Subunit: 202 residues, 3 copies
């Protein structure tokens, strides 16, 4: 289910905020601007409450998941609250096993070939590449040869200026954080439109 969605939409909003109220406002803005894939990070206070209270956005077509998951306890709260996918900055075998038990899509984050192979051995072929800015599109191109079956979602410093370079390198989708989600809701809505249009343009 999830693979096809990331393939279709090509962008996930990585939602960081300092309150439940701010996170909800930003999720709503990104969605109004055309971003349907929305990751509520666990750096948001009461992130699980946010996910539960965004059920109304799901009714409209939004796909709400959880990010910055660094423990199975957070993963469980995320899933119980309605998360449709789980993302972490790192590779975590425990979270991977939890998500399989629940039948929930997990996208671990990797930065190295060894992390990549460990993730692939746990059944993962769609990987978050984090921090993408640091390793660059070059990393994605380098992985093509040895790992033709693996697809990346680079996250970390993705912005309007570098988004097309990532798609030129062969990426499945991008995770956009601060370049998308910072600002007044009107600003965020218009940044969401800018990103959707930028991607449709590469």
């Amino acid at each position: 289910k999830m693979e096809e969605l990331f393939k279709k939409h090509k962008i996930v909003a990585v939602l960081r905020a300092n309150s439940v109220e701010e996170a909800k406002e930003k999720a709503l803005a990104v969605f109004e601007g055309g971003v349907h894939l929305i990751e509520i990070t666990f750096t948001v206070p009461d992130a699980d409450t946010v996910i539960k209270e965004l059920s109304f956005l799901k009714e409209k077509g939004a796909i709400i998941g959880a990010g910055t998951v660094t423990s199975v306890e957070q993963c469980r709260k995320a899933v119980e609250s309605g998360a449709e996918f789980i993302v972490s900055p790192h590779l975590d075998e425990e979270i991977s096993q939890f998500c399989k038990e629940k039948g929930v899509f997990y996208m671990p984050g990797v930065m190295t070939p060894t992390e990549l192979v460990k993730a692939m051995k746990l059944g993962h072929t769609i990987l978050k590449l984090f921090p993408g800015e640091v390793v660059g599109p070059q990393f994605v191109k380098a992985m093509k040869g040895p790992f033709p079956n693996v697809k990346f979602v680079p996250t970390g410093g993705v912005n309007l200026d570098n988004v097309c370079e990532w798609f030129k390198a062969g990426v499945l989708a991008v995770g956009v954080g601060s370049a998308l989600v910072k600002g007044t809701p009107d600003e965020v809505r218009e940044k969401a439109k800018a990103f959707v249009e930028k991607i449709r343009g590469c």
Copy 2:
């Protein structure tokens, strides 16, 4: 292998879409002066390719396997005559198998922590991958804390940067697409250029 890497300085990392293409490129490269030939397991029937190139060993070619990601692949490569095993990552299971089998294994590493784990498994010659991400800078940085580790970078090594890599302190380089892509004739020629450029530094 240590001494072979030291002497030859270049390993062709051979990716190809067929057995026939892989064999023709391995011959091209050898004819152009590259003695260390790594048949990656992304080559279809990479097993068969290594076995069918076994005769080149009699001409002094050293045929190994690359992109080895499981012990099952490792077994097939060794069974078919691979003289060395290379992977993009550090694999404890492949390390152990190659230790018992008495075959040289060069794991790939990208970080100081990965490097240290590989050293603890008995390795001091490491594939650095992807070289284009981490660069000569990484090789120079490792000389401080780990003076006795030596790297063989794979990834983006080309005619313009091969000498910088050797300036940074690498033991040999692994060259893929810059060497191996194109037709047999183009590959044999690019092989010659790399040997001369490397000798030239």
Copy 3:
């Protein structure tokens, strides 16, 4: 205590050298130039001798530690010789445990988010980022989002040109090797003065 000393002093001299006498010459030079945090690496011959012999600087306010610690054996010798902190290029769980037991500050080095999370699970929030020149201040900015409580001390290529960029990126302190330590004692002392001024400035 070390967290507080890092924040106060902001720069650690990372001493590599080919002899005891060279290491001591460089330590004195850097100290006379106002760098109080001094890391003797275990690539210095008889580095534990260097640590013991520099003990007199401690009454002057120097804080002397050991770096390039790659085994518990070296860690035990360093602490025995008077090392007040321990640093490694990598994350070593055995060293972390030993240092925990002995009650000595340990700063493991990490280069990836997966290594970072493992180090956090071992109790570390202050991390060496190595090699700094490969991941850059962009790694430090990228980590602020998911790991807002983690503080970095980059080592690798920090120099007078980029030192303020690392601090502007959010680093707690910097580890400086050859940009600081290379040269005649007189040269090293003036570079130490230069680094302390430049850091105070930004």
